[PDB]
Amino acid sequence: RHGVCWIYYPDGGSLVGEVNEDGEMTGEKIAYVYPDERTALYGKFIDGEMIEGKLATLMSTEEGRPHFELMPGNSVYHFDKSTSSCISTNALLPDPYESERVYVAESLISSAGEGLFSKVAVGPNTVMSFYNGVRITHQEVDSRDWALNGNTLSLDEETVIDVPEPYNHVSKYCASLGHKANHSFTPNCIYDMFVHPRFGPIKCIRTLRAVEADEELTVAYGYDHSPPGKSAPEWYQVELKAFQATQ
Numbered sequence: 623r624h625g626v627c628w629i630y631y632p633d634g635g636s637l638v639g640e641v642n643e644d645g646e647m648t649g650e651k652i653a654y655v656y657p658d659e660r661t662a663l664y665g666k667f668i669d670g671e672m673i674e675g676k677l678a679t680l681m682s683t684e685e686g687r688p689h690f691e692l693m694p695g696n697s698v699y700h701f702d703k704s705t706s707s708c709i710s711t712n713a714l715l716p717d718p719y720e721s722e723r724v725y726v727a728e729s730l731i732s733s734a735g736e737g738l739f740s741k742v743a744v745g746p747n748t749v750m751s752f753y754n755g756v757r758i759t760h761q762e763v764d765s766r767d768w769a770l771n772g773n774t775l776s777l778d779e780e781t782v783i784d785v786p787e788p789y790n791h792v793s794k795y796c797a798s799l800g801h802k803a804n805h806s807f808t809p810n811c812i813y814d815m816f817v818h819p820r821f822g823p824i825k826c827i828r829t830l831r832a833v834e835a836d837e838e839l840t841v842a843y844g845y846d847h848s849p850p851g852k853s854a855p856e857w858y859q860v861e862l863k864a865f866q867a868t869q
């Protein structure tokens with residue numbers, strides 16, 4: 623008669639609900655559940671695509687049927703995959719899972735600008751932040767000045783994610799914050815694949831180790847002598863030389 627399906631993504635998120643006649647995740651009581659197995663976007667989905675998800679908490683799962691408590695408020699989300707020229711339908715609507723785990727402040731790395739910090743203590747392998755952005759080609763990134771590529775992150779062999787000016791200011795764009803994490807060759811985080819209900823296929827920032835509250839989150843940007851683009855910044859030259867001096 624009735625059938626509830628739990629789909630687990632490799633990144634730890636999941637989709638749960640009763641499948642329709644065609645075995646599709648289509649209905650008004652479908653939920654995406656974030657990797658903490660607690661934070662959920664609950665509501666209207668069509669074939670697994672979020673049409674109207676409301677912020678909710680997964681309280682329990684008695685005999686496979688999940689119980690969701692809607693969060694007080696009007697926080698509503700929808701599938702909203704970026705394009706080459708549009709980063710988001712609501713650039714100032716933050717992600718609720720990210721908002722519990724990270725914040726932006728002045729970096730502790732000299733002259734690095736702003737950085738990304740842990741709000742709370744978390745264990746290893748914890749998804750902390752999402753790296754959404756516009757979707758451009760490797761050709762575009764490779765064919766321009768590398769000074770324009772400080773917020774680029776390759777998604778796959780076809781697509782590079784970017785957060786271009788003016789979206790590099792949190793007052794202009796705070797829907798995701800992964801671009802605010804600075805580089806280190808002793809990083810405490812990595813970039814990892816992520817299938818997001820709002821952003822679609824993107825990258826996330828995942829901890830490599832346990833992190834304390836208010837620790838700066840860092841990721842290795844790469845190990846090449848120079849970043850993609852035309853005509854490396856010296857801060858990276860200095861850190862790369864120090865990295866290579868250890869071996």
Ligand SMILES: Nc1ncnc2c1ncn2[C@@H]1O[C@H](C[C@@H](N)CC[C@H](N)C(=O)O)[C@@H](O)[C@H]1O
Nearest residue numbers: 731733734735736772773801802803804805857
């Ligand atoms: N280890 C570092 N030392 C100095 N500057 C850094 C370092 N890591 C990142 N940056 C700076 O941060 C840019 C990369 C951004 N994705 C990071 C967020 C940036 N700090 C901001 O305030 O928006 C680089 O192009 C540099 O300007």
Ligand SMILES: CN1CCC(=C2c3ccccc3C=Cc3cc(O)ccc32)CC1
Nearest residue numbers: 768771772774775843844845846849850
């Ligand atoms: C999250 N992304 C941020 C930008 C980034 C850069 C880069 C770009 C501009 C200026 C500086 C950098 C720094 C290092 C780097 C090294 C590589 O071997 C490949 C790419 C990069 C890749 C990761």
